C-alpha cells in the first residue's frame, strides 16, 4: 500500500500571505513512461464535499484560481497558495491514485493568523428550572480567544472534576478570526446541592497566569 502523510496538521497564515502545505508518499507515485506523478489535492470547506484543485501533482483543475500551485515529485509534494484569501480557509487533502487502494493524506487545516487574544471567561450556574428535573449543568464560556489551544479545569469545593464535563469549540469567527469554547459540567441535583464553590480555571497563552471564575451556590 501507500501511506500519505501531510504536514503540518494545522497552518495559520495572514490574509494575503503565502501558505505552504506538504504531502509525502511512502513510495513513488511516478507513473512511467508518461512520467506523471499520480497525486491530487482537494479542498474541503465545512459542510461541503471536497473539490479537486490539482491533479498530476502540478496541473490546476479548470476554474481554479492561479494563486494555487502544486509541486514536487516521487514522494514529496507541496501545495502553495501564493496569497491567502478568506475563501481559501479550508481543510486540504492530498491523495495518491498510482495504485489501488487510492489513499488520502490525513488533511491540513488552513486557518487565518491573527494577534493573540486572551479569552473573556464567564461561569453560569444551573437554572432553577433545570434543577426541578433532577440535573444540574454548570457552564463555563471562554469568549473570543486566539490561538485555539486552551485548557479548562473544573473544581467543586477544590475537588478536581474529571470525566464529568464535555466541551466544544466554534470555528474561527467570521468577523474577528477568534475561537470560543463552551464547557459543561454535569451533576445530579442531589450532588449539586451538597457543594458550595463551583469554579472554572482557564489556561491560555494570552493570560499571564490561569484565570478562575467561580460562584457560590445560593448566593
Amino acid at each position: 500500500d501507500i501511506v500519505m502523510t501531510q504536514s503540518p496538521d494545522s497552518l495559520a497564515v495572514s490574509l494575503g500571505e503565502r501558505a505552504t502545505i506538504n504531502c509525502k508518499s511512502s513510495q513513488s507515485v511516478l507513473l512511467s513512461p508518461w512520467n506523471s506523478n499520480q497525486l491530487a489535492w482537494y479542498q474541503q470547506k465545512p459542510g461541503q464535499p471536497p473539490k479537486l484543485l490539482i491533479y498530476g501533482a502540478s496541473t490546476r483543475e479548470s476554474g481554479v484560481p492561479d494563486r494555487f500551485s502544486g509541486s514536487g515529485s516521487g514522494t514529496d509534494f507541496t501545495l502553495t497558495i501564493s496569497s491567502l484569501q478568506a475563501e481559501d480557509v479550508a481543510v486540504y487533502y492530498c491523495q495518491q491514485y498510482y495504485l489501488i487502494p487510492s489513499t488520502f493524506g490525513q488533511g491540513t487545516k488552513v486557518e487565518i493568523k491573527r494577534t493573540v487574544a486572551a479569552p473573556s471567561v464567564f461561569i453560569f450556574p444551573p437554572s432553577d428550572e433545570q434543577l426541578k428535573s433532577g440535573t444540574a449543568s454548570v457552564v463555563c464560556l471562554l469568549n473570543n480567544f486566539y490561538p485555539r489551544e486552551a485548557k479548562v479545569q473544573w473544581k467543586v469545593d477544590n475537588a478536581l472534576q474529571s470525566g464529568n464535563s464535555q466541551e466544544s469549540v466554534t470555528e474561527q469567527d467570521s468577523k474577528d478570526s477568534t475561537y470560543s469554547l463552551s464547557s459543561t459540567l454535569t451533576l445530579s441535583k442531589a450532588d449539586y446541592e451538597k457543594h458550595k464553590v463551583y469554579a472554572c480555571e482557564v489556561t491560555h497563552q494570552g493570560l499571564s497566569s490561569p484565570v478562575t471564575k467561580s460562584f457560590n451556590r445560593g448566593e
Partner: protein
C-alpha cells in the same frame, strides 16, 4: 453538467440494514468508475472502494472489504453502498465520487453532496431550553439540552441580534442525546432595558421554543 446525486440523510438504529445511493447524470455512467469515501465526524477522508458500473468490477479497501457491499445498477445510472447490520461506529458522512477519465487511474473529478448516516439507539426528542442568565460587557445565553437527532438552530431576538452571538457545536452525551449552548455578549448597561430571547427550532421533532433570558432575582 455532470452531477452525482446522493440519497438523503439517514438516521438508523444499530443492527438495521441500510442501502444508500449515488445517481450519475450528464454523462455516460458506465464509462467512469465510481468511488465511495467515508468521513467520520471531525476526521479525514477514507477511500472505501470503487466500482466499474459497466461490469460491476469492484475493488475494496482491505479496511472495508467484508464490512460493506458496493454495487451498481447501470440501467438507472446508480451506484450503491450497503450494510447488512449497522453499528454506531458507522456514523459518518459518505461521499460518492467519479474517477476521472485518465488512462490508468485518476483523481476524483466530481463528488456527490454526501449522505450523512447517523446510527444510534436514541429516538426523536425535542430539547428542553434553559437560561444562561447574565451574572461593560455581559454574557448571556441558552442551554439547549437533551434532543435527538441533530441539528437544532438558535437565533436571538427573532434574528435582530446577530452581533456577538456564538452557537456552539453540539456535544453527544452518554445518554445518546445532544446538548448545545448559544451565547451572546452585550453591553452590561442594556440588561435593565433590553429584552433577550433565544429562538430555538428543532426541526426533526417539530419543536419550537422561545426563551426569555434575564438577570436572576
Amino acid at each position: 453538467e455532470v452531477q452525482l446525486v446522493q440519497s438523503g440523510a439517514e438516521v438508523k438504529k444499530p443492527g438495521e440494514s441500510l442501502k444508500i445511493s449515488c445517481k450519475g447524470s450528464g454523462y455516460s455512467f458506465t464509462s467512469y468508475w465510481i468511488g465511495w469515501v467515508r468521513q467520520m465526524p471531525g476526521k479525514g477522508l477514507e477511500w472505501m472502494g470503487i466500482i466499474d458500473p459497466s461490469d460491476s468490477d469492484t475493488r475494496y479497501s482491505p479496511s472495508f472489504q467484508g464490512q460493506v457491499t458496493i454495487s451498481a445498477d447501470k440501467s438507472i445510472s446508480t451506484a450503491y453502498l450497503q450494510w447488512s447490520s449497522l453499528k454506531a461506529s458507522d456514523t459518518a458522512m459518505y461521499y460518492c465520487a467519479r474517477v476521472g477519465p485518465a488512462d490508468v487511474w485518476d483523481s476524483f473529478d466530481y463528488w456527490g453532496q454526501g449522505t450523512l448516516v447517523t446510527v444510534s439507539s436514541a429516538s426523536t426528542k425535542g430539547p428542553s431550553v434553559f437560561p444562561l442568565a447574565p451574572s461593560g460587557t455581559a454574557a448571556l445565553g441558552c442551554l439547549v439540552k437533551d434532543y435527538f437527532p441533530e441539528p437544532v438552530t438558535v437565533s436571538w431576538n427573532s434574528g435582530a441580534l446577530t452581533s456577538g452571538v456564538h452557537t456552539f457545536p453540539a456535544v453527544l452525551q452518554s445518554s445518546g442525546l445532544y446538548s448545545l449552548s448559544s451565547v451572546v455578549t452585550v453591553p452590561s448597561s442594556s440588561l435593565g432595558t433590553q429584552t433577550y430571547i433565544c429562538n430555538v427550532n428543532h426541526k426533526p421533532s417539530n419543536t419550537k421554543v422561545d426563551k426569555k433570558v434575564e438577570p436572576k432575582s
